[PDB]
């Protein structure tokens, strides 16, 4: 407890509290409400929205720029092998393509 209400100081560099362990826990500006409650995450993205009158309701226009960077693993079914392969042979720079192959 850098400052246990006693007037210690705990100055390490330029007379500034010494980052204690209790500081990280209940910051804020740290865990608790930043590393345990609301965590960033991955496989996501965002951008400006626009209108379109021509999509079904449950439809969402996804720009290729993003589609070319997501996923979305998907195990190899015996139903896919042929279909799924075409994707790889295509490339990760061609929409109908892929990135990474897991073994």
């Amino acid at each position: 407890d850098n400052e246990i209400a006693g007037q210690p100081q705990a100055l390490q560099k330029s007379g500034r509290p010494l980052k204690s362990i209790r500081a990280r826990l209940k910051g804020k500006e740290g865990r608790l409400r930043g590393n345990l409650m609301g965590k960033r995450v991955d496989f996501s993205a965002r951008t400006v929205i626009t209108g379109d009158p021509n999509l079904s309701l449950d439809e969402l226009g996804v720009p290729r720029s993003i589609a070319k960077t997501l996923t979305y693993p998907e195990t190899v079914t015996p139903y896919n092998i042929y279909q799924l392969q075409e994707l790889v042979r295509n490339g990760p720079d061609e929409h109908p393509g892929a990135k990474y192959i897991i073994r």
């Binding site: 995450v41 496989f43 996501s44 993205a45 965002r46 951008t47 400006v48 929205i49 626009t50 209108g51 379109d52 009158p53 021509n54 999509l55 079904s56 309701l57 449950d58 439809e59 969402l60 226009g61 996804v62 720009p63 290729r64 720029s65 993003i66 589609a67 997501l70 996923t71 979305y72 693993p73 998907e74 195990t75 929409h95």
Partner: protein
């Protein structure tokens, strides 16, 4: 469901904008892609724009036809609008699931004509009934007043927000809920596709003319405003002879302030009510309103009639400095001709000694909008952080984390 267009923004569906309480002011929205094939299932079978068109918050719909497709419906569900055989055809290519059969024409006279209701009632499911019965309505029509559908065909009145918006017994509500999302989900695709297509070639728009009240009928506006000065004159001076009086709630100075903000507020309505009651029914902005699409009676009266008086903390423009509203006025000037209260509209429109009063009333709902932006959020988390605990157990009862039971029903 993604897919997949070009250009770098998220295209999404207008009728879905209400749930995201956010326009296209250059807003951002986040996308989270699932991975495992077991979540892909959750957000498909439970959470779906379709199975989410009716929140239980209110057991009422949360999405509906809004904006241009709505303004369009009115201006097209009118029985003044016939369709040339020439299309029809063209517009039949949305539905999107078309019988293939071309609808039996309503007019076999010299030209073959289709009513605007006809081909509209096409994109509504088959076998949904409605008896809207609005205010004044008679054995007669009497004049496209009300609304009423049968075997998925309308026959009565005119479509507006009253019926294709999140209304109680709303048409949107009524096919949802009979027979579930889809063709339900298609409803928004049909009307929001048919009509947009109609409107494309019908054109619609507004200019100033739509804001400038009749010259003759504007004389009578300025008459009922200056004729409410006399109604203050008989108050500014008659309550200097102690002949008010006051009561209740008090006080005496306040029960004066009252009998004025009352006369000023009501006196305005007269000027605005007359300004509209004198505007051709076919006047843009007035029809945009009748539809429901955007804006209201108080938006028209303020644009073409007057504007003030503006307020602030529940009391017309406050004094200070000294005993005066501003340095272009005497002292003890408890008159509207000064204390927040404009006589003109955003057409002439506003006068200096007025312009400011307006801006400083404006900067109140301009911070009261700065709060609801945060506070509203704070109070939200409170509840959650005390109700996460509860949930409905397989026994038919809602219980605490610890099992401590809070309800014996599912909600009584």
């Amino acid at each position: 469901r993604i897919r997949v267009m070009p250009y770098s923004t998220f295209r999404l569906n207008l009728s879905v904008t209400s749930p995201y309480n956010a326009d296209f002011d250059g807003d951002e929205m986040n996308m989270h892609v699932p991975q495992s094939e077991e979540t892909r299932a959750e957000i498909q079978e439970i959470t779906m724009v379709p199975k989410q068109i009716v929140s239980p918050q209110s057991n009422k719909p949360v999405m509906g036809i809004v904006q241009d497709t709505l303004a369009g419906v009115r201006k097209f569900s009118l029985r003044d609008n016939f369709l040339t055989r020439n299309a029809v055809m063209n517009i039949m290519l949305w539905v999107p699931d078309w019988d293939g059969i071309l609808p039996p024409p309503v007019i076999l006279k010299p030209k073959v004509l289709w009513t605007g209701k006809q081909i509209l009632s096409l994109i509504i499911p088959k076998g949904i009934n409605l008896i809207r019965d609005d205010d004044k309505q008679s054995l007669s029509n009497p004049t496209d007043s009300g609304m009423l559908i049968e075997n998925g065909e309308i026959i009565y009145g005119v479509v507006d927000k009253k019926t294709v918006g999140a209304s109680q017994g709303g048409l949107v509500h009524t096919i949802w809920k009979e027979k579930g999302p889809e063709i339900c989900k298609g409803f928004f695709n049909g009307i929001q596709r048919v009509v947009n297509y109609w409107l494309l070639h019908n054109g619609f728009s507004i200019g100033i003319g739509d804001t400038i009240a009749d010259a003759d009928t504007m004389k009578e506006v300025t008459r009922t405003v200056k004729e409410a000065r006399r109604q203050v004159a008989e108050c500014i001076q008659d309550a200097q002879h102690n002949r008010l009086k006051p009561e209740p709630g008090m006080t005496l100075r306040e029960s004066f302030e009252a009998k004025v903000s009352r006369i000023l507020n009501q006196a305005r309505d007269n000027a605005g009510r007359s300004a509209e009651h004198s505007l051709k029914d076919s006047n843009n902005v007035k029809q945009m309103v009748a539809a429901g699409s955007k804006g209201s009676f108080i938006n028209i009266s303020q644009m073409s009639a007057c504007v003030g008086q503006q307020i602030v903390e529940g009391k017309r423009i406050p004094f200070g400095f000294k005993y005066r509203t501003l340095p272009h006025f005497p002292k003890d000037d408890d008159s509207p001709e000064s204390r927040g209260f404009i006589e003109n509209s955003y057409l002439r429109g506003l006068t200096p000694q007025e312009f400011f009063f307006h801006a400083m009333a404006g900067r109140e709902g301009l911070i009261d909008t700065a709060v609801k932006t945060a506070e509203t959020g704070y109070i939200q988390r409170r509840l959650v952080k005390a109700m996460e605990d509860v949930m409905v157990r397989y026994d038919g009862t809602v219980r605490n984390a610890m099992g401590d039971i809070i309800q014996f029903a599912y909600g009584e």
